[PDB]
């Protein structure tokens, strides 16, 4: 049956991927494998039951640990990377806690692999953490693997996939060549000699209490002053235009913020959790007329904004503004600026190149925007944009270096980019479609231009041209033609619906829906007695909302506000702007954040 969509509606819930948390299937013994959504996802959420830390929701080591517990009654110890499992000489018995000797068997030897063994993939460029799975079965020319975070389909059988097992000249080699442009060969597998499987349908064992999870340390975000002895004089590459424009706008004992890992996890979980919460509320807003009114969206744009919502469920960037209190441990989110990507480059790149220009870069501390570029290539990869992408900005260096930084990411995943300052790149063709000067019809637009500016330019265009108007090649292309043209299937990065979560009117909605959430401040459409007592700010819609206040603590006399980035659908990094009096966007210093990693 029928569809008006000519180009297919896009989304981040891809085909051949079931949603986060859904069961893909069961390993022999009834061990559930859960979907991690897609292969770059990180929930930041621990899986814990009766004080037993199984691992991170749903990453690969988590399935191994849970599986080994259910299947052989053994507790897999803590390991930084999946690949480090292959160097393990012993695991623990869940009851006695005593050590249990494992046997490392290597791939590509005269030893045939066997079932109920932990298969381990090595560390490599495009899989730098490695991987672990479970051999469930072994045939004459294949093995079967059960795992998490490799394939995201619904399991047909009792394993995620089969893998080739080569046998030549008396040597057995498991090869993973499913995708033959990314062939992979596991180190080998661990076996557990003398420990029989538990009877299928047996209940889960209970663990010795001394094997409970240790409460992790408190999150901290500490301002520190550095003693640099190895300084680089000129550090930003002027050949990379993004770095060049940035230097052209501003200029080339020092200071920074240091977080521990736990603070970083809290941001990943809180940010990811808030993203879902904002999106949910957006659906509420979209399906309600009364609310579209409340958000000051003119009624003439309701069908188009609803189109946007149904058609394009993909997006590239958004930023939460957090405050963090070291004493109380509280993170609180003010605002989700989900439609202007301001300071992506600072957080994504400049921050790290600054650390490298002083000696702050080490093995033990990692820049808080490490994942931005990888998650930004993924964002484009799964965005749904194919073919050319026009990057449209104003005559301001900030927007250009932002655009270019994204264009790089886009181009790295095979999308053709074209940077467009103002609108003289574009012409109307014979049939009234917007085209670029190579004669290519506009398909995908990334932009800094805001939708409110577009709506305003629209109503001007109406008066200045008349309602009877229809475009022709003699007509010049305005902002509204590019964003609010007759072509509604153009993919926009940041889609029109993105104004909804950025509107403060959504704040009471997300409070009412999820008051329990520790990052959410109380917000109302009308002033309550509760708020008169706790403190409040009267914040407008273009009437107004009332939002709880939150003490903003100082360090070395600096106030700090934290920017948390959603790139595509993955929380991807933090950045801090800093001021002794008032943090005021560009005019305030960017501070670099370093995460102190888990040295066991
Ligand atoms: Br039993
Ligand atoms: Cl298409
Ligand atoms: Cl994990
Ligand atoms: Cl390795
Ligand atoms: Cl409508
Ligand atoms: Cl006020």
Please choose, from the candidates 71, 107, 110, 109, the residue with its C-alpha nearest in 3D space to the C-alpha of residue 91. Answer: 71
Helix (H) or strand (E) run with residue 56 in it: strand 52-56
372: its two tokens = 């931005």
Distances in Å between the Cα of 192 and the Cα atoms of 155, 168, 186, 536 are 26, 26, 18, 60
Beta carbons within 8 Å of 394's beta carbon, 6+ residues apart: 421, 422, 448, 449
On the CB side of 82, CA atoms within 13 Å amount to 30
In angstroms, rounded to a whole number, what is the distance separating the alpha carbons of residues 185 and 174?
7
Q: Hey, which bits of 139-275 come out as E strands? A: 142-146, 161-168, 171-175, 188-191, 221-225, 255-260
Q: Which two tokens stand for residue 81?
A: 């990377």
Cβ atoms 190, 118 nearer than 8 A: yes
Could you tell me the distance, in angstroms and rounded to a whole number, from the CA of residue 131 to the centre of ligand 4? 10
Angle, in degrees to the nearest 10, between helices 261-287 and 302-311 = 130
Instruction: Return the ligand number nearest the Cα of 307.
Output: 5
| Distance from Cα 506 to the centre of ligand 5, integer Å | 20
Q: What is the resolution of this structure in A?
A: 2.8
Tokens 């999946």, residue located: 82
Between the CA of 59 and the centroid of ligand 3 the distance, in Å, is 5
From ligand 6's centre to the CA of 547, what distance in Å? 9
Sheet holding 523-524, edge to edge: 523-524, 544-548, 536-540
Strand blocks (E) in 496-549: 523-524, 536-540, 544-548
Residues whose CB is less than 8 angstroms from the CB of residue 363 and which lie 6 or more positions away in sequence, other chains included: none
Helices (H) and strands (E) in the chain, counts: 13, 35
> What are the φ and ψ backbone dihedral angles of 214, each rounded to 5 degrees?
-80, 120
Residues surrounding ion ligand 5 at CB below 5 Å: 302-303
Do 355 and 361 touch, CB atoms closer than 8 A?
A: yes
- What is the Cα–Cα distance from 264 to 368, expressed in whole angstroms? 8
Tell which residue, 164, 137, 113, 131, has the closest CA to residue 28.
137
Residue 81, classed as helix, strand or coil, is coil
DSSP state of 197: P
Ligand nearest to the CA of 306: 5
Residue 185 Cα to ligand 5 midpoint, Å, equals 54
- List the domain boundaries for the chain: 1-203, 204-600
As a whole number of angstroms, the distance between CA 577 and CA 588 comes to 6
Separation of CA 26 and ligand 1 centre (Å): 20
Which ligand sits nearest to residue 44's alpha carbon?
Answer: 3
How many angstroms does the Cα of residue 84 sit away from the middle of ligand 4? 7
In whole angstroms, give the CA distance from residue 577 to residue 558. 10
> Residue 151 has which token pair?
């394939």
Which residue from 444, 427, 437 is spatially nearest to 487, judged by alpha carbons? 444
Question: What is the fold of 1-203?
Answer: endopeptidase fold (from Nostoc punctiforme) (3.90.1720)
- Residue 286 in contact with residue 500, Cβ under 8 Å? yes
Residue 251 gets the label, from left (phi > 0), alpha (psi -120 to 50) or beta, of left
DSSP 263-312: HHHHHHHHHHHHHHHHHHHHHHHHH-HHHHHHTT--GGGHHHHHHHHHHE
The number of the ligand nearest the C-alpha atom of 127 reads 4
Pairing of strands 417-421, 389-393: parallel
Two structure tokens written together for 375: 């998650």
Query: Whole-angstrom Cα distance, residue 177 to residue 330?
Result: 47
Q: At what angle do helices 241-249 and 397-412 cross, to 10 degrees?
A: 170
Alpha-helix residue ranges (DSSP H) falling in 48-125: 60-72
How far apart are the CA of 497 and the centre of ligand 6, in A?
A: 28
Q: How many residues does the chain have?
A: 600
The CB density around residue 542, as the number of other CB atoms within 10 Å, is 10
**Could you tell me if 142 and 165 are in contact, meaning their C-beta atoms sit under 8 angstroms apart?**
yes
Q: Cα–Cα distance between 58 and 21 in angstroms, integer?
A: 7
Ligand nearest to the Cα of 386, by number: 2
Task: Retrieve residue 376's tokens.
Answer: 């930004």
Alpha-carbon distance of 107 to 18, in angstroms, equals: 31
Please return the burial class of 155, using the count of CB atoms within 10 Å of its CB with bins 0-12, 13-18 and 19+. Answer: middle
Torsion sign, CA atoms 446, 449, 450, 452: negative
- Nearest ligand to residue 200 Cα: 1
DSSP class of 346: I
Half-sphere exposure of 443 (CA within 13 A, CB side): 16
Q: Which residues are within 5 Å of ligand 6 (an ion), measured at CB?
A: 537-538
Decide if 245 contacts 403 (C-beta within 8 A): no
Proximal ligand: closest to the CA of 123 = 4
Count of C-beta atoms within a 10 Å radius of residue 251 = 6
Contact 445, 389 (CB under 8 A): yes
The rounded Å distance from CA 190 to ligand 4 centre is: 14
Q: Which residue has the tokens 């957090």?
A: 322
State both tokens at 353. 């190149």
Per DSSP, the residues of 557-568 read: TEEEEEEEEEET
**Cα 585 to ligand 4 centre (Å):** 44
Residue 583: Cβ within 10 Å count: 18
Question: In the structure encoding, which two tokens stand for residue 77, read together?
Answer: 């110890």
Rounded to the nearest angstrom, the gap between the alpha carbon of residue 22 and the centroid of all alpha carbons in its chain is 19
In sign, the C-alpha dihedral spanning 145, 148, 152, 153 is positive
Whole-number Å distance, alpha carbon 28 to ligand 2 midpoint, is: 42
Question: Beta partners for 434?
Answer: 428
312-313 and 142-146 beta bridge pairing:
unpaired
Ligand 1 centre distance from Cα of residue 202 (Å)? 5
Q: How far apart are CA 491 and CA 315, in angstroms?
A: 9
444: phi then psi, degrees, rounded to nearest 5 = -130, 130
CB neighbours of residue 244 within 10 Å: 17
Q: How far is CA 555 from CA 82, 156, 341, 534, in A?
A: 38, 56, 27, 24
Residues 506/459, Cβ–Cβ less than 8 Å: no
Q: Report CA(45)–ligand 4 centroid distance (Å).
A: 26
């Amino acid at each position: 049956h029928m569809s008006s969509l000519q180009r297919a509606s896009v989304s981040f819930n891809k085909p051949g991927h079931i949603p986060f948390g859904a069961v893909q299937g069961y390993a022999p013994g009834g061990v559930p494998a859960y979907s991690n959504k897609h292969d770059h996802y990180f929930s930041g959420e621990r899986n814990i039951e009766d004080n037993i830390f199984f691992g991170f929701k749903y990453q690969c080591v988590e399935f191994a640990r849970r599986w080994l517990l259910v299947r052989k009654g053994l507790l897999l110890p803590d390991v930084n990377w999946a690949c480090h499992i292959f160097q393990l000489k012993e695991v623990r018995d869940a009851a006695t806690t005593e050590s249990f000797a494992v046997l490392q068997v290597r791939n590509g030897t005269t030893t045939k692999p066997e079932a109920d063994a932990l298969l381990v993939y090595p560390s490599t460029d495009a899989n730098p953490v490695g991987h672990v799975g479970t051999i469930t079965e072994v045939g004459d020319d294949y093995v079967c693997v059960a795992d998490q975070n490799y394939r995201f389909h619904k399991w047909e059988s009792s394993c995620a996939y089969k893998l080739k097992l080569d046998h030549r000249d008396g040597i057995w080699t498991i090869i993973d060549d499913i995708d033959a442009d990314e062939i992979e060969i596991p180190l080998g597998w661990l076996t557990f000699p003398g420990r029989a499987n538990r009877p299928e349908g047996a209940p889960p064992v209970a663990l010795h209490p001394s094997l409970h999870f240790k409460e992790p340390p408190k999150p901290y975000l500490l301002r520190r002053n550095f003693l640099p002895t190895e300084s680089k004089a000129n550090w930003l590459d002027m050949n990379n235009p993004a770095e060049r424009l940035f230097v052209e706008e501003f200029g080339m004992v020092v200071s920074y913020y240091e977080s521990n890992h736990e603070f970083h996890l809290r941001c990943v979980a809180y940010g990811t959790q808030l993203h879902a919460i904002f999106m949910e509320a957006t659906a509420q807003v979209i399906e309600s007329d009364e609310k579209l009114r409340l958000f000051a969206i003119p009624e003439e744009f309701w069908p188009r904004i609803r189109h946007s919502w149904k058609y394009q469920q993909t997006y590239i960037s958004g930023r939460f503004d957090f405050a963090f209190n070291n004493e109380t441990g509280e993170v609180k989110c003010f605002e989700y600026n989900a439609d202007s990507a301001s300071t992506l480059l600072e957080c994504g790149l400049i921050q790290q190149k600054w650390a490298e220009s002083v000696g702050l870069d080490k093995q033990d501390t990692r820049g808080s925007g490490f994942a931005v570029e990888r998650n930004l290539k993924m964002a484009w990869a799964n965005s749904g944009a194919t073919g050319r992408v026009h990057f449209c900005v104003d005559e301001e260096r900030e927007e250009q270096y932002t655009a270019l930084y994204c264009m790089q990411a886009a181009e790295a995943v095979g999308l053709e980019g074209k940077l467009c300052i103002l609108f003289d790149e574009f012409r109307f063709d014979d049939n009234g479609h917007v085209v670029d000067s190579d004669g290519v019809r506009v398909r995908n637009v990334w932009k800094t231009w805001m939708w409110e500016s577009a709506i305003t330019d629209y109503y001007a265009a109406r008066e200045e041209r008349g309602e009877n108007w229809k475009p022709s090649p003699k007509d010049k292309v305005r902002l509204c033609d590019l964003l609010l043209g007759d072509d509604w299937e153009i993919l926009y990065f940041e889609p029109m619906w993105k104004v909804i979560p950025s509107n403060k009117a959504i704040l009471p909605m997300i409070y009412h829906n999820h008051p329990e959430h520790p990052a959410i401040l109380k917000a109302e459409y009308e002033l309550t007695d509760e708020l008169r007592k706790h403190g409040y700010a009267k914040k407008p819609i273009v009437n107004m909302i009332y939002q709880q206040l939150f003490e903003l603590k100082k360090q070395d006399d600096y106030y700090a506000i934290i920017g948390g980035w959603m790139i595509g659908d993955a929380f991807s990094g933090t950045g801090i702007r800093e001021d002794k009096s008032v943090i005021t966007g560009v005019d305030s210093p960017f501070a670099a954040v370093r995460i102190k990693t888990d040295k066991l």
